[PDB]
């Protein structure tokens, strides 16, 4: 199976640079170009380069000529992204993409997961967990507040409530750290009796928190 | 260069009606092949965008035969001849015949639903946030629709400009109605100096708009 996976999220400051791996099995390594896409928020998506494995060759585009630099290990069918001067607007999620055609046919291309960049000032911080408590149909949920970078992941009961869970976008604070809620619906009738626990993960700080949310 | 020109940019289908998305190259994506380089793709956030068609019109393994693609040249179709709830997201088309690989602006396709008012819920501040020295109110309106909704913030009735965020989910994969979460933020101090807290939410399902509120620390 045709399998290209990406090293992990990235954090810097300005000015620092960021290496971006992509792993490959189950293919010809060097039979294809790999490519890379980004996406920035708010943005459409961007064709940053490309890399062609039997000879090495590189093509950047125009807005990334000496900024970046692509190569790659025949060895270990690996290709690799560095992106250097990083600024804030090169926060975005980054792609390799296996191409279309290996010079005799064409088809679908296979992409990578992604790797988030996030460029900012700010400094990693694990988030604090709060509970929005409740008191026929209730509402509660958890405040998941000043942490940094994005993501984090909330689950219910450890994966077993998902019916009228809103786990809603982060917002950005105005001290560079981003806050977040997630809530659901249950019976009334449950409060007191169901325990009701939401399952806060934020890799970056390596914080995971399991908190229960009661009535009032 | 290529220019890949995508419209429309919002479409709002009511489900069970057939939907169609264009793509226009500035010049034909043809024969240095067979194939004409054109893609169709949906973005899913937090991993790899889905092929839906691939090379003009071959439908990827797995994505429903309401999905179908066709063009010759500089003018290409996605076409779903039956919307349905789930098909809700943003759709791209893109070109490989050069690089740079360049995109199409991209279609939101919004399923038209019957109007939901909100159903509004408000949470004071935790004790456990306020020994921390900080205070979050938190407005949620549940399962409404359509998306367009005002939130407005009352602290002993003086309407609060500036110190709310808010964020809205995408619409719903099942009932296609939206979500939204306002925060209201205050220090602890300004939090204990007032007793009325209160949201107030306009919506077209609302004849008038709805006032959620509490009075601090009463059970």
């Known amino acids: 199976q045709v399998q290209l996976v990406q090293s992990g999220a990235e954090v810097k400051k300005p000015g620092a640079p960021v290496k971006v791996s992509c792993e490959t099995s189950?293919?010809?390594?060097?039979?294809?170009?790999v490519h890379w896409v980004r996406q920035a928020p708010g943005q459409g998506p961007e064709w940053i380069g490309r890399?062609?494995?039997?000879?090495?060759?590189?093509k950047y585009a125009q807005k990334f000529q000496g900024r970046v630099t692509m190569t790659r290990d025949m060895s270990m069918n690996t290709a690799y992204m560095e992106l250097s001067g990083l600024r804030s607007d090169d926060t975005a999620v980054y792609y390799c993409?296996?191409?279309?055609?290996?010079?005799?046919?064409?088809?679908?291309?296979?992409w990578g997961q992604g790797t988030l960049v996030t460029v900012s000032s700010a400094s990693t911080k694990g988030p604090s967990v709060f509970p929005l408590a409740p008191s026929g149909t209730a509402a509660l949920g958890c405040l998941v507040k000043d942490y940094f970078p994005e993501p984090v992941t909330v689950s219910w009961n450890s994966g077993a409530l998902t019916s009228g869970v809103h786990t809603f976008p982060a917002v950005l604070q105005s001290s560079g750290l981003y806050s977040l809620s997630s809530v659901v619906t249950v019976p009334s009738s449950s409060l007191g009796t169901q325990t009701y626990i939401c399952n806060v993960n934020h890799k970056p700080s390596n914080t995971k928190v399991d908190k229960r949310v009661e009535p009032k | 260069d290529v220019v890949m020109t995508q419209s429309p940019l919002s479409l709002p289908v009511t489900p069970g009606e057939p939907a169609s998305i264009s793509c226009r190259s500035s010049?034909?994506?043809?024969?240095?092949?067979?194939?004409?380089?054109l893609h169709w793709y949906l973005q899913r956030p937090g991993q790899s965008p889905q092929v839906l068609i691939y090379?003009?019109?071959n439908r990827a393994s797995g994505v429903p035969d309401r999905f179908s693609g066709s063009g010759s040249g500089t003018d290409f179709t996605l076409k779903i001849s039956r919307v349905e709830a789930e098909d809700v997201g943003l759709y791209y088309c893109?070109?490989?015949?050069?690089?740079?690989?360049?995109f199409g602006q991209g279609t939101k396709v919004e399923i038209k639903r019957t109007v939901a008012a909100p159903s509004v819920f408000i949470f004071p501040p935790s004790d456990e946030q306020l020994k921390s020295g900080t205070a979050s109110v938190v407005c949620l309106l549940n399962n409404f629709y359509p998306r367009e909704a005002k939130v407005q913030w009352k602290v002993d009735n003086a309407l609060q400009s500036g110190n709310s965020q808010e964020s809205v989910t995408e619409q719903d994969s099942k009932d296609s109605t939206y979500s939204l979460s306002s925060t209201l933020t205050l220090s602890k101090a300004d939090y204990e100096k007032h007793k009325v807290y209160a949201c107030e939410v306009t919506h077209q399902g609302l004849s008038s708009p709805v006032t959620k509120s509490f009075n601090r620390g009463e059970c």
């Open positions: 189950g293919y010809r390594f060097s039979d294809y170009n």
């Open positions: 890399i062609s494995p039997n000879s090495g060759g590189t």
């Open positions: 010049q034909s994506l043809l024969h240095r092949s067979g194939h004409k380089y």
């Open positions: 993409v296996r191409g279309h055609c290996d010079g005799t046919t064409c088809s679908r291309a296979y």
């Open positions: 893109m070109q490989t015949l050069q690089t740079p690989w360049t």
């Open positions: 090379l003009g019109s």
